[PDB]
Amino acid sequence: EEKEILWNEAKAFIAACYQELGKAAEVKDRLADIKSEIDLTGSYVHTKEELEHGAKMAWRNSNRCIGRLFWNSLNVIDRRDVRTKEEVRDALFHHIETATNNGKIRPTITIFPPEEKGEKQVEIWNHQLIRYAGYESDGERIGDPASCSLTAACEELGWRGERTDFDLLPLIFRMKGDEQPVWYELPRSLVIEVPITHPDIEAFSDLELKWYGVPIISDMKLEVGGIHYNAAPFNGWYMGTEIGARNLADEKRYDKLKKVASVIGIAADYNTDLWKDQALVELNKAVLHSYKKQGVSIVDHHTAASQFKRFEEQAEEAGRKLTGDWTWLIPPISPAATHIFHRSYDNSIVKPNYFYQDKPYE
Amino acid sequence: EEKEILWNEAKAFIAACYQELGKAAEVKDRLADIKSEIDLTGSYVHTKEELEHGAKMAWRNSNRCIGRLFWNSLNVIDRRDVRTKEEVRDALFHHIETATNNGKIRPTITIFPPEEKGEKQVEIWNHQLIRYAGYESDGERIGDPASCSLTAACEELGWRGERTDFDLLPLIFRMKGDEQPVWYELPRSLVIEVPITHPDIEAFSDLELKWYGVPIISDMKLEVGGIHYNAAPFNGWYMGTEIGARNLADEKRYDKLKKVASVIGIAADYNTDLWKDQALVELNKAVLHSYKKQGVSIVDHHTAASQFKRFEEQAEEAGRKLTGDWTWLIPPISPAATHIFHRSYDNSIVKPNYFYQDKPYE
Ligand SMILES: Nc1ccc2ccc(CNCCCc3cccc(F)c3)cc2n1
Ligand SMILES: Nc1ccc2ccc(CNCCCc3cccc(F)c3)cc2n1
Ligand SMILES: Nc1ccc2ccc(CNCCCc3cccc(F)c3)cc2n1
Ligand SMILES: Nc1ccc2ccc(CNCCCc3cccc(F)c3)cc2n1
Ligand SMILES: C[C@H](O)[C@H](O)[C@H]1CNc2nc(N)[nH]c(=O)c2N1
Ligand SMILES: C[C@H](O)[C@H](O)[C@H]1CNc2nc(N)[nH]c(=O)c2N1
Ligand SMILES: [Cl-]
Ligand SMILES: [Cl-]
Question: Binding site annotation covers B148?
């Protein structure tokens, strides 16, 4: 069954990819080659062109992503040549540096060798390459609760954090053939962080909030033409609400709205005062202001939705069906001020695509 | 087929209803009676108890409603006895008066005779019993665009509005056997309206906004045990976001956010300033403040979601399955500050329930 599944996915992908690349005439011959290769080896290897375009298609097909207008400008780094943990580490460091680009963030994906027999070659444990630790013990909560299980796993392995609310987790990944992952502390020279200040409320800095500049998601599987790239970290840049409305606001994350209300000078006593809503707006204004001030790319949810409308229009012009997940595309503040709220989307799954996979810790 | 459909719905409803009322032992005999009645007449008539409990169950099963905690306190007015247009008009006037209750709004439904052969006895044209007219001509837009087609239909019938932005539409409904509906101007003594002011921005009154106190939805069909009550106007009280985030804010409704931004003293020039979000918060604060000041019932979205969580808990305690439509239950401002955003809901349709039906105008 496995081989047949692979061959079917390969036939669909190659046809579509080569069609999009103006290479329709090469399909027959390429498919023949792939079919022999599957017979004799159990798999097939993508050309560089296939791999690049496949990673772009996968972004274009990500139903939950409002940022898809820019799918064709993904910078694809092909690292299928890595064999050692130093090579992996150095590729991840490189990805951070080139994606960061001094703050003018470049959407980038680094693709490592794919699973073979469902056997991973490289297994990345980080949820994002840059992310803060979380601790919970003796009633005491420090840092990012979303990171508690991974933090615990790192500390089992000899890493120890300073126990600030913003400790950078080490890179942590496992190689085929090793029982345990290895970990490496992130060089601070590679990591841009943004202190959160507010454009006109001076006290906002008293909250001592910060966040990291570049979200590099490193635990999803890229599937292209039946090949499973389980290790393929990618990034765009933030939409401000991801930080201001969720990471810093959720009760199960940094839970900052009461503190925000206090520094902006409003009571947090009555639901009818809409103080949470007001605090959310000011915290989100601060996040956008702060990234812009530090010269780190970010987009607000209004501009993001406007770009997404153009993506809808582009798909139409291209004669491509549009898929989307309304429940994730709407922003978590003022969703009905965006066009997204007022239309519906077909949440069908089209491949190539990015998929969740099981956590190796937990 | 029609009769079989009716009988099946009747069997399911009576069983469930009588179970909930502690009348399980009466089911067999009641079903027998209903079955003969369907045979001989083509339909059956609900007892008063059945009708009351059925309208309550229908509210309880309304997946899109965040207000369902209070389903069992619905005041059910049985008007299956009406035969004349004066009786209909007077029942609608009565519903407005008793539901309004001097501002301490009573959730109420008035139930008119049901369809017979799919033949309506009374057909109400209003979307809500109290609602503002809309006009669009010669580029000129006045009032509520959502009401343009019904307004045009009323004016075809000899009604003429003053062409303010808040003209009250007349009651308009048709009787079986009449070709045209009749219309009646609403007595202003029956209609409470709330001027919108802001708790601390004095200029907010310069916008001259107002809204009506009680939303009385009068164009949905109540279905109970296979009987179709197409005319059964009901009301609760507003959640503030329905007025402040949608009716007064949507670009295709009163479209007030730029004007709000100006009176609250913020620029409406840059998406990154989140001025729409800020204007939405202040407009919603004003709406809640204004209703509370006038002594007219209203609920904010935080308190509403907290009540809805108790509804979820109540259903659990009662051993009843919960259904809901996440896409409608989340409020349109700060949705992720409510528990609703963070869970999922089974959007299955359970009857009794309230359903949309085709507009007789348009
Ligand atoms: N005490 C701490 C904690 C975390 C820290 C993280 C980063 C840094 C220093 N970051 C410098 C990043 C400069 C930079 C600029 C442009 C591109 C790039 F990749 C890095 C210091 C920290 N100091
Ligand atoms: N700006 C972007 C671009 C791409 C993105 C891809 C994935 C995600 C993360 N989605 C959430 C993964 C599940 C989750 C939720 C909350 C906390 C947590 F640690 C993980 C954010 C992105 N944000
Ligand atoms: N120019 C206008 C336009 C619309 C109007 C609507 C209502 C009224 C007067 N409304 C009085 C309502 C008083 C009231 C109190 C308690 C219960 C109740 F049903 C009505 C005047 C208008 N005047
Ligand atoms: N507070 C309540 C209680 C019950 C409600 C029942 C129905 C509705 C109306 N739902 C919208 C019907 C479709 C629609 C959307 C926008 C404008 C318009 F005229 C009609 C509001 C309620 N609001
Ligand atoms: C339970 C629910 O699906 C959950 O809150 C979802 C809803 N929509 C979302 N949308 C985005 N963009 N991100 C999220 O984390 C979520 N959470
Ligand atoms: C097109 C989309 O379904 C539409 O905007 C829905 C979404 N959620 C909603 N939720 C509520 N409560 N009311 C609405 O009018 C809508 N509109
Ligand atoms: Cl994040
Ligand atoms: Cl309304």
Answer: no
